[PDB]
Amino acid sequence: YHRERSNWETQAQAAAREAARLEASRTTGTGAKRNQGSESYNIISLNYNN
Amino acid sequence: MLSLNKTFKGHLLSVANLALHPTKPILVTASDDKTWKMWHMPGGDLIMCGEGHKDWVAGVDFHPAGTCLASGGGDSAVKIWDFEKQRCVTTFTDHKQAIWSVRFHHLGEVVASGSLDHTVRLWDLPAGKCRMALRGHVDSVNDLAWQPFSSSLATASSDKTVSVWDARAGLCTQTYYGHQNSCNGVSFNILGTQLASTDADGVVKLWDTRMTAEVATINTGKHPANKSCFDRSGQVLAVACDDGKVKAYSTTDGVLQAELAGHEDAVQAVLFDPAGQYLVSCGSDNTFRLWS
Amino acid sequence: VFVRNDLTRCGQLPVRDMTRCCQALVPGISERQVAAVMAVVDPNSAGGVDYRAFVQKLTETGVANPRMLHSAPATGALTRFGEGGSLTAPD
Amino acid sequence: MREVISIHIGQAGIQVGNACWELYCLEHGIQPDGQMPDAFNTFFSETGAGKHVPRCIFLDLEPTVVDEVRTGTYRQLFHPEQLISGKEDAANNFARGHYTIGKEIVDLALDRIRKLADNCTGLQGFLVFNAVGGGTGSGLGSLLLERLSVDYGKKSKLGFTVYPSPQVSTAVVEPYNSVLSTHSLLEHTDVAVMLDNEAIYDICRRSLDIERPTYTNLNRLIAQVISSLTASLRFDGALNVDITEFQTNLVPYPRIHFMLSSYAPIISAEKAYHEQLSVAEITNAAFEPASMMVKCDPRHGKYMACCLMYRGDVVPKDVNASVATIKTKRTIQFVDWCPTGFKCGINYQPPTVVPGGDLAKVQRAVCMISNSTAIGEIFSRLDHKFDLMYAKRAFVHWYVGEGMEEGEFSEAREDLAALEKDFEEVGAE
Amino acid sequence: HRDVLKWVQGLDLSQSLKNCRRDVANGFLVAEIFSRYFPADIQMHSFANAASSHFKRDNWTQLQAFCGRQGINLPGDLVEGCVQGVHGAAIALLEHLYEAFTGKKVP
Amino acid sequence: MREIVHIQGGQCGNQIGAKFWEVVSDEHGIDPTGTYHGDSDLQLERINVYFNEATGGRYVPRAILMDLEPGTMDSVRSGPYGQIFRPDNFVFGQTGAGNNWAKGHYTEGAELIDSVLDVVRKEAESCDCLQGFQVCHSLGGGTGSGMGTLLISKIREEYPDRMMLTFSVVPSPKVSDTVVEPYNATLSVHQLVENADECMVLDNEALYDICFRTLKLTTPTFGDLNHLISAVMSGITCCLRFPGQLNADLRKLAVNLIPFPRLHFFMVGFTPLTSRGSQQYRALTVPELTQQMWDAKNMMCAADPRHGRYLTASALFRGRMSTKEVDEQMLNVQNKNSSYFVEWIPNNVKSSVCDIPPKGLKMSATFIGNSTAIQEMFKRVSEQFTAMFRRKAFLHWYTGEGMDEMEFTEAESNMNDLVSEYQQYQD
């Protein structure tokens, strides 16, 4: 039981680390800085970003 | 061009003998399960089945018209069944010894039958009585056949004697002792000129009607060959063996030509379809697989 | 049915209106029976719930056999599809 | 008194009977406990004091549907000895349900019928529910109806049978089972009402507006058809009909005993308030091909006789106005040798509404059961199916080894072929 | 060969031969033949059809005891070869029984 | 009331059986101690199909575990849910087959086959009416293949009217666990044709395809493959243990999936196999089950259904569903691609609806399909067998145990008989 639980814990920890990296990159805004617009306002409807 | 393409089964015990319809692609087999089953080559499925024999059905035979099928069993019973209504017309049990083989006449009126009483009897479907009984062998008559035109009846038994007879008068014309051991099956040619004898030596010997000249002598497997047949093409002779092999010997191409080892047990029946390309073989493995 | 009875395009309908909708869908539901599902779906709502949430919760919590509703008032063997030797635990 | 004995065979029989007896206990006010808090004598035999039991037997070879009645919401209603279950099912095999596994359970079935028949004084007939696409319904239903004819002579038998659909069906060997069961019900059943699940599926989708109908939805509005057939026996009305009245106005020949079915007002409550259900408007919905309970086109055939079962607030005047406007419509068509092809039956009770069904509370209703030559289309579609499979002996060794001989397939094929020939020549001008 | 195959078919045994060497190894087929030739002496009730070595030895021991009582002789070496499954011992025992029960010749 | 007797052979069958008895006893609510801890009354209604009531209220599984290696039954005692089994049914050998079909079938398996039949006869007579015999074993091994097929031959002769279920795992195309697989596989399937009423083919490298592509398991444990196998075997016997709208036992599945007697080799697959990342994004609906069921990557055999036409099919649906909307998916899948379905069988698909879903899962389905494409993984084994046997290699470890070379030509020809009759229906 300990061996197979360790195997599943390694799988779930790899998955959770990947999910945590993606969530951190989404929250801090570093990810898709290629796709991030400039000037910090909506260019179509002239309203401030939130 | 002889390989395995289709298989036909449906019997619990060993298959004793088999035959084909005279002008239809249907094979009727008689096995040790006390039944006779007809199957279709193109589909592999059964069409008709008949039961009622008390013991193992030793052999089956069909008339030239194919209306009446005879079945000789191990309980000394010869049952004649009509395929049009699936009705057993007659059940002759006058013999007290085991019956081996049957052969209908040219017109199909009467059929000769061999028993273990060292005699060959003649039975009629309408009369149901013995018309003529002949005795020319000291052992059980294993096979009987009739010529297509004349009254040349060939009887093969375990006494190593093939008897050519005139059974209408109840007399034997002559007997030939070419076989070195017991004989199980005599297969005529397309005409009545040549007859091939089976033996425990394992040789396909095709003697003449009266000259008895062995034109070709060939060897078979170690076990004794039991069943023989001649293809309608006039150049191929099929011989089963009890070692699990069916040999197709060519008359004009190097004697032995083809060997089929698809079977796994002793084969006791071999025939060729009327088309001329496919052979129907039986065996002790309860699989009457038709070779292409 | 709830959209048809909703007159203001709210997304919410009151208790009597949803009782009428439930009776239209199938006759014989009591107003108390509707209100119990109202309280289950949205506890702190003063009046009226989302009929989308109501239908969604009923369709997600519906069962095939009326016998097995009795257990309604440990995750499962097949629901994991992994940790195959970790199904249950010793002691 | 008037009494009918309902015999439900097979998985379709038990679940249709579950929905049917749910409706009948609600009509008379019988609680599921079995106690009412004189019309009930048609379907219920009042045992002593304070208890009414169904006049039914629920027989199936598999136990898995008999037991859910025994532990459902109707534990105390049914007599425990009338629900008959076996060890193993026929398993979609006509040979099993008829010869091998069905013979040892029909002897207990006839004993239960004999106790039910002797209790009732005047027995009107036997209503048989079975599925010809299954093993027990086709197989055991055959052997039971063989015994019912030889033992209870001249007593009427009505067959509300579920017949396989052309488009979609739930099994593979239904063309074998239904074709063999055709000979069983051709010579024995006095009335055979054809039900097709695909047609009831399409009825539910376009009338009740249910995109995903279920077997429970289907059996609930099959029950309204069965109830309206027997509604005149239980409750009084202007134009009373009986079981013997039902045959003599529908079947003109002994070998033609197949009829369709159509229940015209089938609406949800959102449909109901905007619909002014008049007698003429409902009767036009009865003869609509879409409202038929079997997937056949009455336009393709022609009507032979029809039966109109009206319920509720129906005056005997406007039923005749509905008949007159139907006759003048050219879309329907009648045989020339039946100039008065209508049977009208009016009852004075609106149909009951089950708490739990998709049907609304309506004031008037119509069940229309008609004999026509369009039923030759129904048998012709599975005639092509059975001839296709039997041509190369597929799915035959399951039948041959289980007692049945090979010749019973071709005899049932010729019997079905002769039934097609009768339907074509009788309606011919 | 053909004579012993005809003889074993004529008794109409429940067991089918096929591979006869493996078929007659357990002793059920030879027990059936002996029971047909002596219905009162040998019954199929006292024999177990199984591939177990102990049950095989039990069946062949009963057969040996009863045939020794009745005078019919089969080789013990052939019995050992049959229970060990060597090729040809089963065949030779079959022809020996064929000659012993109803006497004919071997070619 | 329609009892199923489970029999396991070899290292694989005991490991398959250990996960099988974990899954079934979980949805029945049976603890490893032996008591009952369920929360619904539906579990105790039909529990005698798999568990025998004992003294004190304990439930003991109807399992017979056999192997010629005695250490392997120590592994099933060591496994979880290992103390529920009766110690008497743990019939054990001493020597071990060692990947030899002949050692398990004639020489070393014969001394143990008397006691296995002793407990099978004891177990069958205890219950009221048998519904069939369920066996899970290997074909590439020596115990599950040699001793298994001798047992299947023995219990078919003694009990001829009872059904047979073989969840036999077959040797793999790509990578093989042992060299002598085609010798054991061809000899096992020769005995399976005339004995097994229906056979269900599993492959390990088809299971690895499920665990990698669909389940997104980066390192699948060897017991995770048995979880997928146990999910299917619990689904075949679904309608017996639980009520449903359309019921179908193992006999009704046999009469619909088997048009001709020798064509009883199926390939199967469990439907709602979803990863945990994609768990939240998929709507657990009936159409999402049906098209994923018919997908080639779900099926647990190496044979691809796209190559050959479907002969018959069977669907076993569990949970809250609609009968029309289940059935219309089966008519739709027969018309959108009609080339993959045989023409002389109308309505190739059978469907059953069960009302009790698996525990923790809202709705599931199980597929069984008889196809003429299953000959691809028998011609492949015949390709492996004809290479080895023609040079008579690896044969002295088979001919030393009593069998001759003629028995190899029996299985070689009978393997080629099955692929001949499957091929002529593909045309």
Ligand SMILES: Nc1nc2c(ncn2[C@@H]2O[C@H](COP(=O)(O)OP(=O)(O)OP(=O)(O)O)[C@@H](O)[C@H]2O)c(=O)[nH]1
């Ligand atoms: N209309 C309707 N048909 C049903 C219902 N239940 C089952 N059926 C029909 O039953 C057919 C299947 O055959 P079954 O009735 O289940 O077979 P059986 O009578 O139980 O016989 P066995 O299966 O051998 O036990 C299907 O084609 C369905 O159309 C139902 O509740 N309503």
Ligand SMILES: Nc1nc2c(ncn2[C@@H]2O[C@H](COP(=O)(O)OP(=O)(O)O)[C@@H](O)[C@H]2O)c(=O)[nH]1
């Ligand atoms: N899916 C699966 N396959 C297994 C398992 N155990 C063994 N196998 C397979 O079975 C084959 C070997 O069978 P084996 O256990 O040695 O059979 P035996 O020696 O006859 O008892 C190998 O190809 C393995 O891949 C298991 O738990 N699950």
Ligand SMILES: [Mg+2]
């Ligand atoms: Mg059923």
